[model samples]
Target chain A: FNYESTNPFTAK
Target chain B: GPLGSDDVEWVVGKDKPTYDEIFYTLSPVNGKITGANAKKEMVKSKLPNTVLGKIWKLADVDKDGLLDDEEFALANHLIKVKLEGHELPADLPPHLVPPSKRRHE
Candidate 1:
């Protein structure tokens, strides 16, 4: 699976 | 604090991007990601390594002690996955996995 931003403000 | 008078610093893109993003985008190949380098980077970055040996043993398909881009990415995401989920190697430290703050790139 690809990854996404871990930042809480940003949506995965 | 007057909003109209003060400069606005946007938080939207303020946080620096992760090393995974940067490394994948840049795709640097100056040096092979060797065991020594990996260990140093991992430890320094404070990643959880309770079962690190196992992960490395499995990830390094040829057991060359170095990881390519795909290998590195797999390891990075796995660590994150393991940390979030309930698994063995409890008491594991909590830290970000991937790239390095000390990395030159």
Candidate 2:
């Protein structure tokens, strides 16, 4: 299995 | 003089001329010019920073970092004048000729 992570975004 | 791709044709102010007829000379087939794209084209000439900045600022009239065909053509024409030292017949405002025609005209 490969590792994964979520990226961030500013709120509208 | 005959027009070609990458040529600039000066027109009356904001006359709503068609891109096909006036602007979009650089890429008549594709239409529209952006700062990044213009930069890519300009960098091929390996222009100096000051000259490049001047053209970029002049072309991006709205400061939105984009140029219509007219802007692209004018900027490209100035680059030719700077690098090739070509003179217009009567000191007209600069306009571009095709790259191959640069030496001939």
Candidate 3:
């Protein structure tokens, strides 16, 4: 599927 | 007052679920979980797919179509963070890296 570009990992 | 990191002070505590707690249930072979399987668990969260999609990008730090134990824990952590309404980062910040993956610098 087509996707668009944009932004932005971590833990519990 | 403490520091800017204090904004995330609520993320930690003795009673909270430890990273290992989140990781063990999902990690499959080789200390990682493939995305489809992970999708099963993450979807269980109340979060919608748009945000879940965003979280997936950040969570899969290794970009291998799978998540290591570290990445799995990290992904869920962001899910928790996003529920609190904080803006997700453009990229991972230094402090947020789990012990297994933190950069030397």
Candidate 4:
């Protein structure tokens, strides 16, 4: 998983 | 050598622009977000609660449990650092303590 995955945010 | 904001800024973005939107939805009505909301979203990160809890406590150098823009940025930045295998700081340095609250650090 990348930062986009690990970061607390989830958006498309 | 010690880590700097430079180390953190990479994941969170230049001056936190990359992550500010996350803070937006998570913020409370008036301003800032408390640990509840912080942990609320942080759980999505799949990180452990104790780790997220510790970062929230450390980033809120103010120790109020309420996170401002900068403090919240630090917490997310920290998540990346720790997630990538870097050791979380025992005590956050002055530079990393959220510029808005550095005076208190």
Candidate 3 regions with alpha-carbon error over 4 angstroms: A1-12, B1-17, B98-105
Error of 1 at B84 (Å): 1.6
Candidate 1: global Cα-lDDT?
0.45
The candidate scoring highest on DockQ is: 3
Instruction: Please give, for residues B1-105, the per-residue lDDT of candidate 4 as tens digits.
Output: 486645543334465864567789886645788656887778888887667767766777666647777777878788777768886785777556555554632
Clashes of 1: 0
**Residues B9-54, model 3: lDDT tens digits:** 3233322356547667775888777766667766787777667777
Model 2, range B14-35, lDDT digits (tens) per residue? 3325322434434533456654
Indicate the DockQ of the complex predicted as candidate 1. 0.03
- Range of the 10 consecutive residues with the lowest summed lDDT in candidate 2 chain B: B92-101
Question: Candidate 3 lDDT, tens digit per residue, A1-12?
Answer: 745433221122
> Clashing residue pairs in candidate 3, if any?
A10-B74
Model 3: docking quality category: incorrect
Q: What residue runs in model 1 are displaced by over 4 Å at the alpha carbon? A: A1-12, B1-19, B22-31, B44-50, B88-105
What's the C-alpha lDDT at position A9 in model 1? 16
True contacts kept of 2: 0.00
TM-score of chain B taken alone, candidate 2: 0.50
Best by TM-score: 4
